[PDB]
Amino acid sequence: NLCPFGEVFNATRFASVYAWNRKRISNCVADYSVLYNSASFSTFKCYGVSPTKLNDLCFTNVYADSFVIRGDEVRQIAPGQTGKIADYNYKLPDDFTGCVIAWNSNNLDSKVGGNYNYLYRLFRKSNLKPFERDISTEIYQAGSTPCNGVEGFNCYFPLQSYGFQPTNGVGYQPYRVVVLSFELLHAPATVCGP
């Protein structure tokens, strides 16, 4: 059984970063080299392991999280980061073992007149936990007074739409991002290389 990475990487539709999607990978053989050597990604960072040794390793599980952000935010998808993306949308553990893979997706996510379909969370009472997912859509209470389900003074909608315009600079562009997380449990390893 070859690991089904095309289903995640070639998925026709990607989630907004606040409702990021997750698939689990187990009991298969992954060929990382064909992803790494592919020339289809502008970022392929790894944490905890060298990308050149991935085909020699075995893991208990793999998790493929995927979403869309802007390019100039791919640096926030990494342990120890801060800001709205890492704090209210997608947090990585300090001891993250995995790899982050990102690419400009104007191919599929460009829209004449603008694409405002991708959203990110703006406010939160506390920071996310590593791999927590907040998809709620309740009004955010930024004051001592309850909001009672409506906007008002100190009461704001918590999500913001990216203004992906064809005219934008190279950093304010839609980037599809896939995070492979390698599970290092004290268990049999079911996902190995060739």
Partner: nanobody
Framework: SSSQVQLVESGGGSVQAGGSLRLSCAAS????????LGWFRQAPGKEREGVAA????????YYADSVKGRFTVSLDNAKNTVYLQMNSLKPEDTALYYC??????????????????WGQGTQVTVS
């Protein structure tokens, strides 16, 4: 000093506009762990930016738009040495040039704040 990768760069100097130079960067240490070679640049009064990059396993290259079509980055595994051929030089290329090597994969654009093994920096002047 205690880093398992050591970069020594050379080939700098001065030259007149329209001329060419060839910077070289020779590594010693954990050569096989290096995944990515980036050339950075700091001109007078500007931050250190990214000039060019080479993915070691691939040969694939990236170039900033200010040097696209004039600079060529290339690899030589016989000598463990990466090269930056700078053609059609113009005075705005005057800068301290640095080579840097990563082991964590690759990422474009280059970013100073990633973890890099750094070279010493070789001067390049064009008038």
């Amino acid at each position: 000093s205690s880093s398992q990768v050591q970069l020594v760069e050379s080939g700098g100097g001065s030259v007149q506009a329209g001329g060419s130079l060839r910077l070289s960067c020779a590594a010693s240490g954990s050569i096989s762990s290096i995944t990515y070679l980036g050339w950075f640049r700091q001109a007078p009064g500007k931050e250190r930016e990214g000039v060019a990059a080479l993915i070691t396993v691939n040969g694939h290259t990236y170039y900033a738009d200010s040097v696209k079509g004039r600079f060529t980055v290339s690899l030589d595994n016989a000598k463990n040495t990466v090269y930056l051929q700078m053609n059609s030089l113009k005075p705005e290329d005057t800068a301290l040039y640095y080579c840097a090597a990563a082991a964590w994969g690759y990422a474009w654009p280059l970013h100073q704040d990633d973890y890099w093994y750094w070279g010493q920096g070789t001067q390049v002047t064009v008038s």
